[PDB]
Design a protein around this ligand. Sequence first.
Ligand SMILES: Nc1nc(N)nc(O)n1
Ligand SMILES: [Zn+2]
Ligand SMILES: [Zn+2]
Lengths: 182, 189
Amino acid sequence: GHMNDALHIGLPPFLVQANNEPRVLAAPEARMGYVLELVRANIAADGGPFAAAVFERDSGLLIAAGTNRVVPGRCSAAHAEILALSLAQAKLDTHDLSADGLPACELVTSAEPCVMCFGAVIWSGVRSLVCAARSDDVEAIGFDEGPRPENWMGGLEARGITVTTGLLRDAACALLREYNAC
Amino acid sequence: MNDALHIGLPPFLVQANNEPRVLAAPEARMGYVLELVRANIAADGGPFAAAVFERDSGLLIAAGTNRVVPGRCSAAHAEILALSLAQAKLDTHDLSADGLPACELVTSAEPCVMCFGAVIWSGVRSLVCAARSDDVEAIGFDEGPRPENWMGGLEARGITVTTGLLRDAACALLREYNACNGVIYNARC
Ligand SMILES: Nc1nc(N)nc(O)n1
Ligand SMILES: [Zn+2]
Ligand SMILES: [Zn+2]
Protein backbone atom coordinates (compact mmCIF):
# COMPACT_ATOMS: atom_id res chain seq x y z
CA GLY A 1 0.00 0.00 0.00
CA HIS A 2 1.97 2.96 1.42
CA MET A 3 4.88 4.68 -0.41
CA ASN A 4 5.44 8.28 -1.63
CA ASP A 5 6.69 8.58 -5.23
CA ALA A 6 3.75 6.31 -6.16
CA LEU A 7 0.32 4.86 -5.49
CA HIS A 8 1.21 1.17 -5.31
CA ILE A 9 -0.87 -1.90 -4.77
CA GLY A 10 1.15 -5.14 -4.63
CA LEU A 11 -0.35 -8.37 -5.79
CA PRO A 12 -0.20 -11.85 -4.27
CA PRO A 13 1.90 -14.50 -6.14
CA PHE A 14 -1.09 -16.04 -8.00
CA LEU A 15 -2.21 -12.67 -9.46
CA VAL A 16 1.36 -11.76 -10.41
CA GLN A 17 1.58 -15.24 -11.89
CA ALA A 18 -1.72 -14.80 -13.77
CA ASN A 19 -0.56 -11.45 -15.29
CA ASN A 20 2.78 -12.90 -16.52
CA GLU A 21 2.07 -16.39 -17.63
CA PRO A 22 0.81 -16.80 -21.24
CA ARG A 23 -2.79 -17.99 -21.68
CA VAL A 24 -5.27 -18.33 -24.59
CA LEU A 25 -8.85 -19.06 -23.51
CA ALA A 26 -10.94 -18.98 -26.68
CA ALA A 27 -14.40 -20.02 -25.40
CA PRO A 28 -16.33 -17.58 -23.11
CA GLU A 29 -16.70 -20.26 -20.44
CA ALA A 30 -12.96 -20.99 -20.61
CA ARG A 31 -12.34 -17.33 -19.72
CA MET A 32 -14.95 -17.27 -17.00
CA GLY A 33 -13.68 -20.59 -15.59
CA TYR A 34 -10.19 -19.26 -15.27
CA VAL A 35 -11.56 -16.09 -13.65
CA LEU A 36 -13.25 -18.30 -11.06
CA GLU A 37 -9.99 -20.16 -10.38
CA LEU A 38 -8.67 -16.69 -9.48
CA VAL A 39 -11.62 -15.77 -7.21
CA ARG A 40 -10.75 -18.87 -5.14
CA ALA A 41 -7.05 -18.10 -5.15
CA ASN A 42 -8.11 -14.67 -3.83
CA ILE A 43 -10.02 -15.96 -0.79
CA ALA A 44 -7.08 -18.17 0.05
CA ALA A 45 -5.05 -14.93 -0.18
CA ASP A 46 -7.20 -12.86 2.23
CA GLY A 47 -9.26 -11.08 -0.44
CA GLY A 48 -12.92 -10.64 -1.37
CA PRO A 49 -14.81 -13.20 -3.56
CA PHE A 50 -14.27 -11.25 -6.78
CA ALA A 51 -11.93 -11.51 -9.71
CA ALA A 52 -11.82 -10.28 -13.31
CA ALA A 53 -9.59 -10.28 -16.34
CA VAL A 54 -9.20 -8.48 -19.62
CA PHE A 55 -8.82 -10.77 -22.65
CA GLU A 56 -8.61 -9.82 -26.32
CA ARG A 57 -12.22 -10.26 -27.45
CA ASP A 58 -11.65 -12.70 -30.34
CA SER A 59 -8.46 -14.75 -29.64
CA GLY A 60 -8.95 -15.12 -25.87
CA LEU A 61 -5.43 -14.03 -25.03
CA LEU A 62 -5.25 -13.05 -21.33
CA ILE A 63 -3.85 -9.52 -21.03
CA ALA A 64 -4.36 -8.79 -17.41
CA ALA A 65 -6.25 -10.07 -14.39
CA GLY A 66 -7.25 -8.62 -11.01
CA THR A 67 -8.93 -9.59 -7.77
CA ASN A 68 -10.34 -7.69 -4.85
CA ARG A 69 -7.43 -6.49 -2.72
CA VAL A 70 -9.48 -3.93 -0.86
CA VAL A 71 -8.77 -5.12 2.67
CA PRO A 72 -5.19 -6.59 2.49
CA GLY A 73 -4.41 -3.70 0.11
CA ARG A 74 -5.79 -0.76 2.23
CA CYS A 75 -7.57 0.58 -0.88
CA SER A 76 -11.34 0.84 -1.32
CA ALA A 77 -10.89 1.25 -5.05
CA ALA A 78 -9.10 -2.08 -5.46
CA HIS A 79 -12.06 -3.93 -6.92
CA ALA A 80 -11.21 -6.74 -9.31
CA GLU A 81 -12.43 -4.63 -12.28
CA ILE A 82 -10.12 -1.66 -11.54
CA LEU A 83 -6.92 -3.63 -11.31
CA ALA A 84 -7.66 -5.89 -14.23
CA LEU A 85 -8.42 -2.87 -16.41
CA SER A 86 -5.54 -0.70 -15.17
CA LEU A 87 -3.01 -3.53 -15.41
CA ALA A 88 -4.25 -4.25 -18.97
CA GLN A 89 -3.64 -0.62 -20.07
CA ALA A 90 -0.16 -0.74 -18.41
CA LYS A 91 0.78 -3.83 -20.36
CA LEU A 92 -0.53 -2.36 -23.66
CA ASP A 93 1.14 1.06 -23.08
CA THR A 94 -2.13 3.04 -23.28
CA HIS A 95 -4.97 4.31 -21.04
CA ASP A 96 -7.43 3.50 -23.78
CA LEU A 97 -7.92 -0.12 -24.69
CA SER A 98 -9.67 0.84 -27.91
CA ALA A 99 -7.01 3.16 -29.37
CA ASP A 100 -6.42 2.60 -33.12
CA GLY A 101 -4.39 -0.57 -33.81
CA LEU A 102 -5.30 -2.43 -30.62
CA PRO A 103 -7.35 -5.61 -30.88
CA ALA A 104 -10.80 -5.33 -29.27
CA CYS A 105 -10.74 -5.91 -25.49
CA GLU A 106 -13.09 -7.77 -23.19
CA LEU A 107 -13.43 -7.67 -19.42
CA VAL A 108 -14.60 -10.96 -18.08
CA THR A 109 -15.69 -10.53 -14.48
CA SER A 110 -16.99 -12.94 -11.79
CA ALA A 111 -19.88 -10.68 -10.70
CA GLU A 112 -21.79 -7.69 -12.18
CA PRO A 113 -20.11 -4.38 -11.46
CA CYS A 114 -20.75 -1.82 -8.70
CA VAL A 115 -21.33 1.82 -9.59
CA MET A 116 -17.59 2.63 -9.32
CA CYS A 117 -16.45 -0.17 -11.54
CA PHE A 118 -19.41 0.62 -13.79
CA GLY A 119 -17.74 3.95 -14.55
CA ALA A 120 -14.33 2.28 -14.76
CA VAL A 121 -15.52 -0.03 -17.49
CA ILE A 122 -16.80 2.88 -19.51
CA TRP A 123 -13.57 5.00 -19.54
CA SER A 124 -11.45 1.87 -19.98
CA GLY A 125 -11.65 1.28 -23.76
CA VAL A 126 -12.99 -2.25 -23.20
CA ARG A 127 -15.54 -3.41 -25.84
CA SER A 128 -17.42 -6.07 -23.90
CA LEU A 129 -18.43 -7.20 -20.46
CA VAL A 130 -19.13 -10.80 -19.53
CA CYS A 131 -20.40 -11.41 -16.02
CA ALA A 132 -21.01 -14.55 -13.94
CA ALA A 133 -23.06 -13.67 -10.83
CA ARG A 134 -25.99 -11.25 -10.99
CA SER A 135 -26.33 -8.17 -8.78
CA ASP A 136 -28.86 -10.02 -6.55
CA ASP A 137 -26.27 -12.70 -5.94
CA VAL A 138 -23.78 -10.03 -4.97
CA GLU A 139 -26.02 -8.07 -2.65
CA ALA A 140 -27.08 -11.31 -0.98
CA ILE A 141 -23.71 -12.22 0.49
CA GLY A 142 -23.32 -8.70 1.88
CA PHE A 143 -21.58 -6.66 -0.84
CA ASP A 144 -23.17 -3.34 -1.95
CA GLU A 145 -23.42 -2.53 -5.71
CA GLY A 146 -24.20 1.07 -4.89
CA PRO A 147 -26.53 3.50 -6.70
CA ARG A 148 -26.02 2.78 -10.40
CA PRO A 149 -28.12 4.59 -13.04
CA GLU A 150 -31.37 2.79 -13.86
CA ASN A 151 -30.46 0.57 -16.83
CA TRP A 152 -26.70 0.40 -16.42
CA MET A 153 -26.74 -2.42 -18.95
CA GLY A 154 -28.23 -0.18 -21.67
CA GLY A 155 -25.85 2.53 -20.48
CA LEU A 156 -22.83 0.37 -21.31
CA GLU A 157 -24.40 -1.11 -24.42
CA ALA A 158 -25.00 2.49 -25.60
CA ARG A 159 -21.21 3.15 -25.98
CA GLY A 160 -19.84 0.18 -27.87
CA ILE A 161 -19.60 -2.18 -24.89
CA THR A 162 -21.80 -5.29 -25.10
CA VAL A 163 -23.06 -6.85 -21.83
CA THR A 164 -23.57 -10.57 -21.13
CA THR A 165 -24.52 -12.15 -17.80
CA GLY A 166 -25.30 -15.41 -15.99
CA LEU A 167 -22.39 -17.06 -17.69
CA LEU A 168 -21.28 -19.83 -15.32
CA ARG A 169 -23.44 -18.04 -12.74
CA ASP A 170 -23.98 -21.25 -10.73
CA ALA A 171 -20.30 -22.10 -10.28
CA ALA A 172 -19.65 -18.48 -9.33
CA CYS A 173 -22.45 -18.70 -6.72
CA ALA A 174 -20.95 -21.83 -5.33
CA LEU A 175 -17.87 -19.74 -4.81
CA LEU A 176 -19.85 -16.82 -3.28
CA ARG A 177 -21.77 -19.10 -0.93
CA GLU A 178 -18.55 -20.78 0.34
CA TYR A 179 -17.02 -17.43 1.22
CA ASN A 180 -20.26 -16.26 2.85
CA ALA A 181 -20.31 -19.56 4.77
CA CYS A 182 -16.87 -18.57 6.16
CA MET B 1 4.83 -2.83 -14.74
CA ASN B 2 3.03 -6.16 -14.33
CA ASP B 3 3.84 -7.04 -10.76
CA ALA B 4 1.69 -4.42 -9.00
CA LEU B 5 -0.86 -1.64 -9.68
CA HIS B 6 1.55 1.27 -9.77
CA ILE B 7 0.71 4.82 -10.73
CA GLY B 8 3.72 7.12 -10.46
CA LEU B 9 3.49 10.56 -8.84
CA PRO B 10 5.09 13.70 -10.42
CA PRO B 11 7.56 15.47 -8.07
CA PHE B 12 5.07 18.30 -7.37
CA LEU B 13 2.47 15.79 -6.29
CA VAL B 14 4.99 13.89 -4.11
CA GLN B 15 5.63 17.25 -2.48
CA ALA B 16 1.95 17.87 -2.00
CA ASN B 17 1.65 14.54 -0.26
CA ASN B 18 4.96 15.20 1.56
CA GLU B 19 4.69 18.63 3.10
CA PRO B 20 2.36 19.15 6.09
CA ARG B 21 -0.32 21.84 5.73
CA VAL B 22 -3.40 23.01 7.66
CA LEU B 23 -6.06 24.94 5.75
CA ALA B 24 -9.10 25.64 7.86
CA ALA B 25 -11.50 27.61 5.63
CA PRO B 26 -13.17 25.87 2.64
CA GLU B 27 -11.76 28.55 0.37
CA ALA B 28 -8.32 27.84 1.84
CA ARG B 29 -8.67 24.13 0.98
CA MET B 30 -10.19 24.67 -2.49
CA GLY B 31 -7.42 27.18 -3.18
CA TYR B 32 -4.72 24.59 -2.59
CA VAL B 33 -6.63 22.07 -4.66
CA LEU B 34 -6.65 24.50 -7.62
CA GLU B 35 -2.88 25.23 -7.26
CA LEU B 36 -2.52 21.58 -8.07
CA VAL B 37 -4.76 21.74 -11.14
CA ARG B 38 -2.51 24.29 -12.87
CA ALA B 39 0.52 22.44 -11.51
CA ASN B 40 -0.91 19.24 -13.07
CA ILE B 41 -1.65 20.86 -16.45
CA ALA B 42 2.09 21.75 -16.45
CA ALA B 43 3.00 18.16 -15.62
CA ASP B 44 1.08 16.73 -18.63
CA GLY B 45 -1.95 15.73 -16.62
CA GLY B 46 -5.56 16.80 -17.07
CA PRO B 47 -7.21 19.88 -15.51
CA PHE B 48 -8.36 18.08 -12.30
CA ALA B 49 -7.07 17.75 -8.75
CA ALA B 50 -8.46 16.70 -5.35
CA ALA B 51 -7.33 16.44 -1.78
CA VAL B 52 -8.29 14.47 1.33
CA PHE B 53 -8.43 16.68 4.41
CA GLU B 54 -9.51 16.15 8.02
CA ARG B 55 -12.91 17.84 7.85
CA ASP B 56 -12.55 19.34 11.35
CA SER B 57 -8.97 20.58 11.52
CA GLY B 58 -8.07 21.04 7.85
CA LEU B 59 -5.02 18.79 8.08
CA LEU B 60 -4.06 17.79 4.55
CA ILE B 61 -3.92 14.00 4.52
CA ALA B 62 -3.26 13.33 0.82
CA ALA B 63 -3.62 14.83 -2.67
CA GLY B 64 -4.41 13.56 -6.19
CA THR B 65 -4.57 14.80 -9.78
CA ASN B 66 -5.53 13.33 -13.19
CA ARG B 67 -2.66 11.05 -14.14
CA VAL B 68 -4.68 9.28 -16.85
CA VAL B 69 -2.58 9.93 -20.00
CA PRO B 70 0.84 10.11 -18.46
CA GLY B 71 0.07 7.09 -16.21
CA ARG B 72 -1.88 5.22 -18.94
CA CYS B 73 -4.64 4.38 -16.51
CA SER B 74 -8.18 5.46 -17.32
CA ALA B 75 -8.84 4.90 -13.64
CA ALA B 76 -6.27 7.41 -12.45
CA HIS B 77 -8.63 10.33 -11.76
CA ALA B 78 -7.67 12.88 -9.12
CA GLU B 79 -10.37 11.64 -6.80
CA ILE B 80 -9.16 8.03 -7.00
CA LEU B 81 -5.58 9.06 -6.31
CA ALA B 82 -6.47 11.51 -3.53
CA LEU B 83 -8.69 8.93 -1.89
CA SER B 84 -6.27 6.04 -2.34
CA LEU B 85 -3.15 7.87 -1.14
CA ALA B 86 -5.22 8.94 1.86
CA GLN B 87 -6.16 5.36 2.54
CA ALA B 88 -2.53 4.26 2.17
CA LYS B 89 -1.12 6.99 4.42
CA LEU B 90 -3.72 6.27 7.06
CA ASP B 91 -3.23 2.46 6.75
CA THR B 92 -6.86 1.49 5.97
CA HIS B 93 -9.47 0.89 3.23
CA ASP B 94 -11.97 2.71 5.36
CA LEU B 95 -11.47 6.41 5.83
CA SER B 96 -14.22 6.30 8.53
CA ALA B 97 -13.05 3.21 10.50
CA ASP B 98 -13.10 3.84 14.30
CA GLY B 99 -10.07 5.83 15.47
CA LEU B 100 -9.77 7.95 12.34
CA PRO B 101 -11.24 11.51 12.17
CA ALA B 102 -13.96 12.41 9.68
CA CYS B 103 -12.45 12.93 6.25
CA GLU B 104 -13.42 15.45 3.54
CA LEU B 105 -12.67 15.21 -0.20
CA VAL B 106 -11.98 18.58 -1.82
CA THR B 107 -12.35 18.38 -5.67
CA SER B 108 -11.77 20.92 -8.43
CA ALA B 109 -14.84 19.51 -10.23
CA GLU B 110 -17.96 17.48 -9.70
CA PRO B 111 -17.00 13.74 -9.76
CA CYS B 112 -17.72 11.39 -12.68
CA VAL B 113 -19.69 8.19 -12.00
CA MET B 114 -16.60 6.09 -11.29
CA CYS B 115 -15.37 8.57 -8.64
CA PHE B 116 -18.94 9.01 -7.51
CA GLY B 117 -18.81 5.32 -6.49
CA ALA B 118 -15.23 5.77 -5.18
CA VAL B 119 -16.63 8.44 -2.87
CA ILE B 120 -19.35 6.12 -1.52
CA TRP B 121 -16.73 3.48 -0.54
CA SER B 122 -13.87 5.81 0.36
CA GLY B 123 -15.01 6.40 3.95
CA VAL B 124 -15.14 10.23 3.48
CA ARG B 125 -18.04 12.08 5.19
CA SER B 126 -18.00 15.11 2.94
CA LEU B 127 -17.23 16.11 -0.63
CA VAL B 128 -16.61 19.73 -1.56
CA CYS B 129 -16.74 20.52 -5.31
CA ALA B 130 -15.50 23.48 -7.41
CA ALA B 131 -16.52 23.27 -11.07
CA ARG B 132 -20.04 22.13 -11.90
CA SER B 133 -20.84 19.08 -13.97
CA ASP B 134 -21.80 21.43 -16.81
CA ASP B 135 -18.53 23.29 -16.77
CA VAL B 136 -16.62 20.02 -17.27
CA GLU B 137 -18.99 18.77 -20.05
CA ALA B 138 -18.62 22.14 -21.88
CA ILE B 139 -14.90 21.66 -22.54
CA GLY B 140 -15.37 18.01 -23.57
CA PHE B 141 -14.65 15.69 -20.64
CA ASP B 142 -17.51 13.35 -19.92
CA GLU B 143 -19.15 12.91 -16.49
CA GLY B 144 -20.74 9.61 -17.52
CA PRO B 145 -24.17 8.25 -16.54
CA ARG B 146 -24.50 9.19 -12.89
CA PRO B 147 -27.68 7.85 -11.32
CA GLU B 148 -30.48 10.45 -11.46
CA ASN B 149 -30.07 12.60 -8.32
CA TRP B 150 -26.58 11.30 -7.38
CA MET B 151 -26.26 14.35 -5.13
CA GLY B 152 -29.17 13.25 -2.95
CA GLY B 153 -27.92 9.71 -3.40
CA LEU B 154 -24.68 10.73 -1.63
CA GLU B 155 -26.47 12.81 0.99
CA ALA B 156 -28.63 9.86 1.87
CA ARG B 157 -25.38 7.98 2.73
CA GLY B 158 -24.35 10.61 5.29
CA ILE B 159 -21.89 12.08 2.77
CA THR B 160 -22.47 15.84 2.55
CA VAL B 161 -22.25 17.63 -0.81
CA THR B 162 -21.13 21.17 -1.54
CA THR B 163 -20.50 22.41 -5.09
CA GLY B 164 -19.48 25.57 -6.97
CA LEU B 165 -16.90 26.69 -4.40
CA LEU B 166 -14.31 28.85 -6.21
CA ARG B 167 -16.24 27.86 -9.37
CA ASP B 168 -14.99 30.98 -11.11
CA ALA B 169 -11.26 30.16 -10.82
CA ALA B 170 -12.10 26.51 -11.43
CA CYS B 171 -13.78 27.62 -14.72
CA ALA B 172 -10.82 29.77 -15.67
CA LEU B 173 -8.32 26.93 -15.12
CA LEU B 174 -10.57 24.73 -17.31
CA ARG B 175 -10.70 27.04 -20.30
CA GLU B 176 -6.91 27.75 -20.35
CA TYR B 177 -6.29 23.99 -20.52
CA ASN B 178 -8.76 23.90 -23.46
CA ALA B 179 -7.09 26.87 -25.17
CA CYS B 180 -3.78 24.97 -24.85
CA ASN B 181 -5.03 21.48 -25.76
CA GLY B 182 -4.53 21.30 -29.53
CA VAL B 183 -1.44 19.98 -31.28
CA ILE B 184 -0.18 23.08 -33.14
CA TYR B 185 2.42 24.86 -31.00
CA ASN B 186 1.20 27.99 -29.24
CA ALA B 187 4.31 29.44 -27.58
CA ARG B 188 2.15 31.20 -24.97
CA CYS B 189 1.42 27.79 -23.35
N1 LIG C 1 -19.44 -4.02 -3.63
C1 LIG C 1 -18.70 -4.78 -4.59
N2 LIG C 1 -19.29 -5.31 -5.71
C2 LIG C 1 -18.60 -6.03 -6.62
N3 LIG C 1 -19.22 -6.60 -7.78
N4 LIG C 1 -17.28 -6.21 -6.40
C3 LIG C 1 -16.67 -5.68 -5.29
O1 LIG C 1 -15.33 -5.85 -5.09
N5 LIG C 1 -17.37 -4.97 -4.38
ZN1 LIG D 1 -16.49 -2.29 -7.98
ZN1 LIG E 1 -13.65 10.62 -12.07
